[PDB]
Amino acid sequence: SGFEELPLCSCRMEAPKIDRISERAGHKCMATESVDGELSGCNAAILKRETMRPSSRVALMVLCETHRARMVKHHCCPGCGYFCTAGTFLECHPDFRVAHRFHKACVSQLNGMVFCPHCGEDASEAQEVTIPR
C-alpha cells in the first residue's frame, strides 16, 4: 500500500556488453519510436555497446547516441519501452526543465491510483503534451 512498492525506472542504468546484444543487432540502434501509437524503428549506427532500457518490462537495447541521450532524459516509456518523441503523451515535471514522458496507459498503478512510472509521483499531476514531428 505504500510508496515503497512503486516501481522506479532504470533509464539511467547501463548494462555491460557481455551478452553480445550489439553484435546480434548488427551494431544498429534497437530503439522504437511511438507517435500516437504508430511505431517506427531507428537502426542508426551505434557507438557504445553497453545496453539500456527504461524498465525490466522490456529487453535490453543497444542504442545510437541520440537515443541514449533521449533515454537518460526519461523520454522513453517504462511501461512499453517505446520512445515518446512526437505526438501526444503525458509528462511529469519534478523539477526545472525535467520531463518524465510516458503513455497514459503505461502509468504505474497502486491501490487503484496512478503514478509516474519513472519517479512515482502522482500521475493526476501529469500534463498532456503534444509535440510535432
Interaction of residue 52 with Zn ion, rule CB under 5 A? no
11: contact with Zn ion by CB under 5 A? yes
Q: Does 9 bind Zn ion (CB under 5 A)?
A: yes
> Any residues with CB less than 8 A from the CB of 96 and at least 6 apart, and which?
none
Q: Is 106 in the site for Zn ion (CB under 5 A)?
A: yes
Q: Which residue spans within the chain are E strands per DSSP?
A: 32-35, 38-41, 83-84, 87-95, 98-102, 108-110, 113-115, 127-131
Kindly tell me which residue out of 77, 90, 99, 123 binds Zn ion, with binding defined by CB under 5 A: 77
Rounded Cα distance between 82 and 65, Å, is 16
Q: Please tell me whether residue 126 binds Zn ion under the rule CB under 5 A.
A: no
| Contacting residues toward Zn ion, per CB under 5 A | 9, 11, 29, 31, 42, 44, 64, 67, 74, 77, 79-80, 92, 100, 103, 106, 116, 118-119, 121
